[model samples]
Target: KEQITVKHQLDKNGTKVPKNPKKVVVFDFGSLDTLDKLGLDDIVAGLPKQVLPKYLSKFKDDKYADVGSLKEPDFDKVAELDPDLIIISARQSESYKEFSKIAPTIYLGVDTAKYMESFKSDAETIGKIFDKEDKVKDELANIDHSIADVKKTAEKLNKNGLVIMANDGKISAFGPKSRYGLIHDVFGVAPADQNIKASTHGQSVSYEYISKTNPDYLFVIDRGTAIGETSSTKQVVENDYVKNVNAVKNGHVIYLDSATWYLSGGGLESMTQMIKEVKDGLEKEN
Candidate 1:
């Protein structure tokens, strides 16, 4: 049977992506996650170290190369990988000019406020690129169904919540426009503190702000800061300010895997894991 071809235009970056791209390298782990959902894992030639041990464990024994960290891509290594196409994110826009020199690259936007829409559109975009529009549609529909079911249950519970990412004693709250704004996108939840807004990549705030917010629910994401160091999600819950919050008193605080929630390249699996965790946490609270 002859292979089918699909064409897609990347809306954010204004690039044309051809269907059935065989030699693709994903700089964004979220892209890797999305491709994995579509059964296109074998097409990924390179990924970041953070992606493994969290979502891409199956690829651990594989022979794919590493093109360095997502924040600082190794252009030399990427050039050597010789990928036909490279997938990057708008957060890494500064590196786009350099990456374009190596291969045909597409810039995907990671807008937290519009996460579901972004994911759905990107999935369709990927589908068009791979000529898998039907498959993508089915997967997106499934995701929507999962989200809806979870939301139905969550709506009955308290909507007062906060999404937090902590590192080195500093914590950041995610608002409607923040990167982890999926809490709102999926369940109509909003941050207790209106002061929290969209941040540039990752931003740091004080414990005083957290205490002032006094949210009913807390979602914590800890990014390991120092080498050989660990940030305990449970400990953050047990902290002074957090203990004062209604979430802790009511046991509404949720500890999420940082890589899956805040760090992973926002793929389908990433979103699924998020929804599942949120559902489970809300159930426990109820």
Candidate 2:
């Protein structure tokens, strides 16, 4: 019939965090997903508009105030709410210093270059904040088991896999060190082209470039569709050049969930979904 509240500290290095923060405002969707998994969203007082994953739609109502745009922070409201802690990552972390002034702003961004490491690290960081370290470790182990299965299957079936993003009919490809590196570097799928240069916006590539690389598995994410842009994945990626590719012929093209891959990568749900997608894609060949 009673409850106790205790404050926890979040170190700059993510070793420890405050226990049961009174008010939390999270700007990163990936971090939000972690909090959701830990059942800590009730403490959340603010969020970005129209961006929560469909499953997190409960926060879309009036109960949660709009902090600001994804990359923009409503400092006025942030300071107004005076949250106990604020979480940010990636683009939302551009204003890191400003957020720190409002409260103990914790930068828990997932490094796409080393997604698996960052995902586990950030989840642990979040777990410390909520006093759920053991729970986080168990969930991560579950994800690792899923990953183990996928890694084995991916190594055998996809000798060379290319990760492409379809954006407004514009095509861009990423290599082992780019944003989608988790596909090739961490998951055991060999990069389709080791020589492909690394880029954050992705290497502006042509359809012929994909044909030239001739990947065995083509992992695609429709960024345009994920963010509601005027583009079609079917039109852009399935063009003449790509249709003749080995992946197309052999049915190894894996269309990843756009929202998970593009919008909410690195969280427990997203990572597990990615593992399953890869496993299921390879299973199709059987």
Candidate 3:
């Protein structure tokens, strides 16, 4: 069988695995999306059943073996499947050692600090593994075109935006270079608060902070709704301080799809949707 060296985020030297895996287990939703987009869905033998993004929910059919949650893997079930290749992300970083023991595992998690660079690299690596480099190139070309379009309008609008995650009635703010900072860092939107903390969980914030920043546009990721709940921006919208902010006044408080933004970001499908959503939001205001 042909072999290829796969370089991933966790491994420096990389691992040599079969070029085209017959049975693949994917712990990363982003990789699953890429595989599905590249028409390699048949090789996917197992995946996490819980918390699948809305678009990728079709994989929940009993055909795909349930390998466990993103953060936790069922070693027994995964081993039983006897996968030739295993793909994982940030959630499974800690379990890399265990996964590698069973099969050649690749980590495709995007480094949030350098969003697009890492995202593209991850997709390219996937292409190499599946011998679909040309398709990946074409898809990335279209994505680049879309990015340029969004950036053009965002720069022209000159609107500063704030990114926040609303979870169970609480809020956390993200600045440029943070996990969800693509809006400001990549899409060319100005940061409403340049000093907002840049961390994995984001900087704990309140309505007062939202009011103080008073950005022209507000990009919201409702984590509550992402996990199948009734949680939304209702609390933030009802807050006097938030309601009085310029984003609310101008109707620029864009409620992004948390399922794509939070659950399955950095995939071909999710990334394009994110860009399009941001583009529509800016054009609507323009």
Which runs in model 3 stand beyond 4 Å of their true positions? none
lDDT agreement with native, every candidate = 0.70, 0.76, 0.88
Model 1 lDDT, full chain set: 0.70
Model 2 lDDT at residue 102: 83
Among these predictions, the greatest TM-score belongs to 3
RMSD each, Å: 3.1, 3.6, 1.1
Over 4 Å off, model 1: 1-13, 50-53, 201-203, 225-229, 232-235
* Ranked by lDDT, top first: 3, 2, 1
**Could you say which candidate leads in lDDT?**
3
Candidate 3 local lDDT, 156-210, one digit each (tens): 9877999999999889999988988888888889999999878878999978899
Off by over 4 Å in 2: 1-17
TM-score of candidate 3 to 2 decimals: 0.97
- Worst 10-residue stretch by lDDT in candidate 2? 1-10
Q: Model 1, range 97-189, lDDT digits (tens) per residue? A: 777788778865565667777777767777777767898888778888988988887777756788887776567777776777677766666
Q: Model 2, range 142-185, lDDT digits (tens) per residue?
A: 98888887789877663778888988888889888788888877
Clashing pairs in 1: 19-129, 30-265
Model 1 lDDT, residue 200, Cα: 47
TM match of model 1 to true structure: 0.87
Ordered list by TM-score, greatest first: 3, 2, 1
Model 2: lDDT of residue 61: 78
